[PDB]
């Protein structure tokens, strides 16, 4: 039983999208976010660096942390970013919230789920 109202709306949004638009990643991300917090992702830059490719939004069904180096110009969408992750990322790419990703890409196309 999530207690955070925001995480709760974000989930309702992801669903509305996956159902209305051609989403599936969004419904897949909502699925995981509905599971308990220990299962949510905690990803450091190093991993996003190792598997991300330009022109393919990285979607982390959790929170992005700041260990390691990110040089690729990638747009990372996540539930949250640590103050440092958002900073290190903005230097080479763009950090956006899933609320925005669903906004520009309700069809959830050209995306890479990273955990």
């Amino acid at each position: 039983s999530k207690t955070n109202p925001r995480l709760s709306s974000l989930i309702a949004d992801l669903k509305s999208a996956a159902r209305s638009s051609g989403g599936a990643v969004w419904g897949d991300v909502a699925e995981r976010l509905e599971k308990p917090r220990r299962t949510h992702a905690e990803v450091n830059l190093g991993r996003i660096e190792r598997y991300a490719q330009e022109d393919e939004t990285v979607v982390v069904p959790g929170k992005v942390l700041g260990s390691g180096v990110l040089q690729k110009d990638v747009t990372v969408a996540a539930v949250d970013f640590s103050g440092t992750a958002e900073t290190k990322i903005d230097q080479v790419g763009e950090a956006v919230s899933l609320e925005q990703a669903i906004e520009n890409n309700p069809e959830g196309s050209h995306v890479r789920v990273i955990r």
Binding site: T3, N4, P5, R6
Partner: protein, 246 residues
């Protein structure tokens, strides 16, 4: 955004920038958590006498006289929990920690989130307050801090169309239950919170349900009585600024 400033007559006297904090996403779960902690942390440890019911050499005859093996003394049962005058099996204990820890970051995020709830007239109206404005919080000239008479503040609140909320609090409730036997016979609605910066407004504090606070130490409970976000606030131009850095 921008917030309109008011002179002690109720007329607009320019305006200033509403600090970013007031943009903090209102978070009622974190707020209620913070308020839950403050309330618990002022509760007093208690518990019954450790020896209550134990002051007796009462013993149990055991088998033999057609009676249950209950400790008796002078023919009366004693000590045991099922005995009238017996000890209390699992009573309240002084040793119990009745406090609640709250990570400073989680708490500060709650104070900021509560601050933000203040700038939402809809939220404020939802919480129950009775006012007739569109802009809230209500910002006032620093000279507000110089008012001395309570009624000088009433006029200003009527001029600001905020006095109705005080009319709301001007109706105490006589609670149901024994609280009254322990001095808790009354309770009244929470109304306007005045946030100044130099000193708590002695002029406003006696107003029905009014709470006075200073910008450097105004807390979650001030901004959200009982964990309910969106209290009808009235900041002082200077207080508004100091609050920006909490």
């Amino acid at each position: 955004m921008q917030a309109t400033i008011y002179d002690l007559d109720g007329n607009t006297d320019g305006e200033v920038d509403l600090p970013d904090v007031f943009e903090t996403p209102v978070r009622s779960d974190l707020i209620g958590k913070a308020v839950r902690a403050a309330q618990a942390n002022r509760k007093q440890d208690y518990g019954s006498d450790e020896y209550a019911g134990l002051r007796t050499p009462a013993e149990s005859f055991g088998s033999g006289r057609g009676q249950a093996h209950v400790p008796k003394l002078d023919g009366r049962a004693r000590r045991v929990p099922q005995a009238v005058k017996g000890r209390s099996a699992h009573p309240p204990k002084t040793e119990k920690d009745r406090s609640l820890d709250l990570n400073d970051k989680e708490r500060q995020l709650a104070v900021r989130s509560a601050l933000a709830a203040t700038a939402d007239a809809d939220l404020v109206a939802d919480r129950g307050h009775e006012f007739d404005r569109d802009e809230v919080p209500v910002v006032v000239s620093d000279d507000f801090e110089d008012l001395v008479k309570t009624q000088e503040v009433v006029s200003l609140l009527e001029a600001l169309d905020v006095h109705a909320d005080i009319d709301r609090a001007d109706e105490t409730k006589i609670k149901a239950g024994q609280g009254s036997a322990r001095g808790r016979k009354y309770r009244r609605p929470a109304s306007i919170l005045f946030v100044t910066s130099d000193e708590p407004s002695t002029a406003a504090r006696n107003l029905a349900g009014a709470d006075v606070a200073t910008a450097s130490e105004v807390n979650t409970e001030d901004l959200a009585p009982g964990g309910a976000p969106g209290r009808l606030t009235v900041f002082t131009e200077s207080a508004l600024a100091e609050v920006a850095e909490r």
